[PDB]
Design an enzyme around this catalytic site. Structure first.
Site, short mmCIF file in Angstrom:
data_model
loop_
_atom_site.label_atom_id
_atom_site.label_comp_id
_atom_site.label_asym_id
_atom_site.label_seq_id
_atom_site.Cartn_x
_atom_site.Cartn_y
_atom_site.Cartn_z
N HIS A 66 -18.24 9.81 -24.25
CA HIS A 66 -16.97 10.33 -23.77
C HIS A 66 -16.74 11.77 -24.12
CE1 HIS A 66 -15.77 6.36 -22.35
NE2 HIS A 66 -16.62 5.99 -23.29
N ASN A 122 -12.20 10.08 -14.57
CA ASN A 122 -13.49 9.46 -14.25
C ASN A 122 -14.55 10.21 -15.05
OD1 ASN A 122 -13.42 11.92 -12.56
ND2 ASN A 122 -15.08 11.04 -11.34
#
Length: 199
Positions: free
Chosen positions: A45, A34
Site C-alpha cells: 500500500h 484504487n
DNA sequence: CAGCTCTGTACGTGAGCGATGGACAGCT
DNA sequence: AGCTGTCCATCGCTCAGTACAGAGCTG
C-alpha cells in the site's frame, strides 16, 4: 522509453490487484481510490516515492517512526489500521475509472465495512466519498467537505472520515505538509473514541 | 432565467530516470 | 603531458486528484 518498473510492462501491471489488509476490531481502515501502477507492482500500500500517505502517517503522530509500504501488514496489530480500495482495478490515475466501476466498488465497499466494522472508515480521496455518499446515503451536497461526515455506515457504528487524496498528483494540497492537518484530526478522533469506549 | 449534471482543462511540489559533462585517476 | 574511461553531481523531463468554468439539459 523510460524504465519505471524494472523491466515489467505497464500492460502487465494493469492486470494486477492489491490485497486488502483487513481484520476485525480495527480503529481505522484507509480506503484508497484504487491501486496505482507502483502499488500493483509492489503488492503493498502507497509505495509511490512521492505518495504522501506514509509521510503524513508519521508527521501526524499516527506512527512513532517513519514507516514505508513494506510495513503495511504490521499496521493492524501495531497501530489498529487496515487498508482497502473503493475500486479493485489498477490504473495510472483516478481519471481512468468509470462511474459504473465506482458504484460497483461502493456496493462491495459498504459490504466489507459492514463485515469488519472498523471504528472509522477513512476515505483517502474526496472523489470516492462523493460517489459513496450519493450511492449509500442518497445524499449529494453542493459543497462536500473533508473530515468527519454526518453519516455512519448503515447498520454499524462506523464513522466516515474524508481526506484529500495522499496522491501527489493533487495540486490543491501540493505537499505532505498541506495534508497532515487531516491526519492529525483523524488521530484526535481515534483517541477521542478510545477514551469514551475505555469506560 | 436558474439550477443541475457532465466533461475538459489547468494546476504546485518533490522524486526517479536518463542524459550530460566536469573531475579525476590510471596509463603510457 | 596527453589520452581515455569511469564516476557522479546535476539537470530536464515525466510522473503521481481536485476545483471549476462552460456546455447541454431540464424544471
Amino acid at each position: 522509453k523510460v524504465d519505471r518498473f524494472n523491466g515489467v510492462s505497464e500492460a502487465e501491471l494493469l492486470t494486477k490487484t492489491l490485497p486488502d489488509i483487513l481484520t476485525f476490531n480495527l480503529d481505522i481502515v484507509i480506503i484508497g481510490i484504487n491501486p496505482g501502477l507502483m502499488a500493483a507492482y509492489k503488492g503493498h500500500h502507497y509505495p509511490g516515492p512521492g505518495n504522501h500517505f506514509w509521510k503524513c502517517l508519521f508527521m501526524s503522530g499516527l506512527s512513532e517512526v517513519q514507516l514505508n509500504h513494506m510495513d503495511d501488514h504490521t499496521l493492524p496489530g501495531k497501530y489498529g489500521i487496515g487498508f482497502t480500495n473503493m475500486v479493485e482495478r489498477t490504473t495510472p490515475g483516478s481519471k481512468d475509472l468509470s462511474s459504473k466501476e465506482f458504484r460497483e466498488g461502493g456496493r462491495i465497499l459498504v459490504q466489507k465495512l459492514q463485515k469488519y466494522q472498523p471504528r472509522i472508515a477513512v476515505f483517502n480521496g474526496k472523489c470516492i466519498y462523493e460517489i459513496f455518499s450519493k450511492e449509500v446515503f442518497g445524499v449529494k451536497v453542493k459543497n462536500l467537505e473533508f473530515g468527519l461526515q454526518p453519516h455512519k455506515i448503515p447498520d454499524t457504528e462506523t464513522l466516515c472520515y474524508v481526506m484529500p487524496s495522499s496522491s501527489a498528483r493533487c495540486a490543491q494540497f501540493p505537499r505532505a505538509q498541506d495534508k497532515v492537518h487531516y491526519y492529525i484530526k483523524l488521530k484526535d478522533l481515534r483517541d477521542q473514541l478510545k477514551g469514551i469506549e475505555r469506560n
